[PDB]
Swiss-Prot record, chains A, B:
Its main location: membrane. This is 3-keto-disaccharide hydrolase. Coiled coil: none annotated. Keywords: Carbohydrate metabolism, Cell membrane, Glycosidase, Hydrolase, Lipoprotein, Membrane, Palmitate, Signal. Gene3D superfamilies: Exo-inulinase, domain 1 (2.60.120.560). It comes from Bacteroides thetaiotaomicron (strain ATCC 29148 / DSM 2079 / JCM 5827 / CCUG 10774 / NCTC 10582 / VPI-5482 / E50). Disruption phenotype: Deletion mutant lacks the ability to convert glucosinolates to isothiocyanates. Monocolonization of mice with the mutant shows reduced isothiocyanate production in the gastrointestinal tract. It catalyses: 3-dehydro-alpha,alpha-trehalose + H2O = 3-dehydro-D-glucose + D-glucose. One of its GO terms (molecular function) is hydrolase activity, acting on glycosyl bonds. Induction: Induced during growth on trehalose. 3-keto-disaccharide hydrolase that preferentially hydrolyzes 3-keto-trehalose (3-dehydro-alpha,alpha-trehalose). Important for disaccharide utilization in the human gut. Also shows hydrolysis activity with the glucosinolates glucoraphanin or glucobrassicin, but with much lower efficiency. It is found in: Cell membrane. Its EC number is 3.2.1.218. The keyword Signal applies.
């Protein structure tokens, strides 16, 4: 009643063959970040946490040097290495001025083959829908895309948060992401700010009007169109986009 | 509020040890061309402005002799000798019929050594991404490369401007180049016409399919793959391609 066993994987595409005993509250929320350790967390594609992610004042901090998607130095996106299917995630997030990050969900670790048969690790964001994290006032991406669909709590490049009720940079915002049987809801500061349905025609259409369309990015389209793969499941994680950001009170409720 | 100090260098690879006071507007655009002088400007690789660059009717003008890439007489590319990193450039350009120029950004002044240890000044474009300037209706290059990737506002030979909304020759076009933490956007006539991201595998992949691939041109590969050198910064400038072209309303906003 106090704890639940949560399986996790240790390296790229590995079985979840170990478990953590993690606290669960009266309402079924599992605390997945203990404020002290990266137990069950690892870099996307890796068997360790990149050193640019640290733990400070009971937060996961990304320590950013400003190269956008470059993921220079010892970076990369971070996942909690337990695949969820139907779940509700709540967490606090705070971005630096001009900052950019993101909360991924239903992520898969994807590789492609190069021309000579070597592996290429593909970005998490071409399998995983992204809840944007952004300083909506100073980062230029805020003004790109359509209808502010690149502002915080948007489904990135697809659906804007309405209302756009983000608190400004350097302040704690609350996120929610619920996926239940294909229904997806994003929450920002305790309001629902968009909703959508996976694996439907409307899903497909949103993808085709995005940077992940079949003609702009064929592999992304394919992965995202059948989001979560054959089993409709994947990781939560957070983005290395080069900028200081903090995450705390990271909690997940398993739905069924 | 009305001006800001802008450092600039006087000669090849020199420190920016002198400063101009340049007007800034309320949006933080710095006017880098004052309509009247070449202050802060110099030939790429030079300590003076080549005499084929003149000021006429409030514009910076290239006076061309028609030798294409030859750069014959007292020509050469022109830089504003202040390195920028995160910035948004806006300027207007007009071409002669059949004309060709370009707008470089993140440029470095590069030399190599010959076989006897002498210096060879390398072209601006082995380091600097090129926003194509072109009479897309009359210059043959327009129909080359791939999917109109040598038309105006393209990332030259690499990404086409879409939509291709150039005005005809002899008419003013508006350009925009924004580099923010590696994200690059080109604008033409107030539409955003391409977006990419420096220092990614996607960037490497574009280079590898280009004339500056590692196999074809290793030095250019190395410089552009790490565009902007170890500090990811470099010059704005414009191209001598042998043809009359006019540039005006040149403003840069520094972003952080
Ligand atoms: O690729 C760099 C340069 O090479 C050639 O000189 C092209 O004619 C010109 O468009 C381009 O600016
Ligand atoms: K993001
Ligand atoms: K050109």
């Amino acid at each position: 009643a106090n704890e639940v066993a949560v399986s996790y994987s240790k390296s790229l595409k590995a079985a979840e063959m170990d478990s953590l005993q993690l606290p669960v509250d009266a309402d079924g929320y599992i605390t997945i970040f203990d404020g002290k350790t990266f137990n069950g967390w690892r870099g996307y594609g890796k068997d360790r946490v990149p050193s640019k992610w640290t733990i400070e004042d009971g937060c996961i901090k990304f320590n950013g040097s400003g190269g956008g998607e470059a993921q220079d130095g010892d970076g990369g996106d971070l996942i909690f290495a337990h695949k969820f299917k139907n779940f509700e995630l709540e967490m606090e997030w705070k971005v630096s001025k001009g900052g950019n990050s993101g909360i991924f969900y239903l992520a898969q670790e994807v590789t492609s083959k190069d021309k000579d048969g070597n592996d290429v690790l593909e970005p998490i964001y071409i399998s995983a829908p992204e809840y944007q994290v952004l300083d909506n006032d100073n980062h230029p991406d805020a003004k790109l895309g359509k209808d502010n669909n690149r502002q915080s709590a948007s489904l990135y490049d697809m659906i804007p948060a309405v209302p756009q009720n983000a608190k400004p940079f350097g302040e704690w915002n609350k996120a929610k992401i619920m996926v239940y049987k294909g229904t997806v809801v994003h929450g920002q500061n305790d309001e629902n700010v968009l909703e959508y349905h996976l694996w439907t025609k409307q899903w497909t259409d949103l993808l085709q009007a995005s940077k992940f369309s079949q003609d702009k990015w064929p592999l992304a389209f394919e992965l995202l169109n059948n989001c979560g793969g054959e089993n409709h499941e994947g990781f939560i994680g957070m983005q290395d986009h080069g900028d200081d950001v903090w995450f705390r009170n990271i909690r997940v409720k398993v739905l069924d």
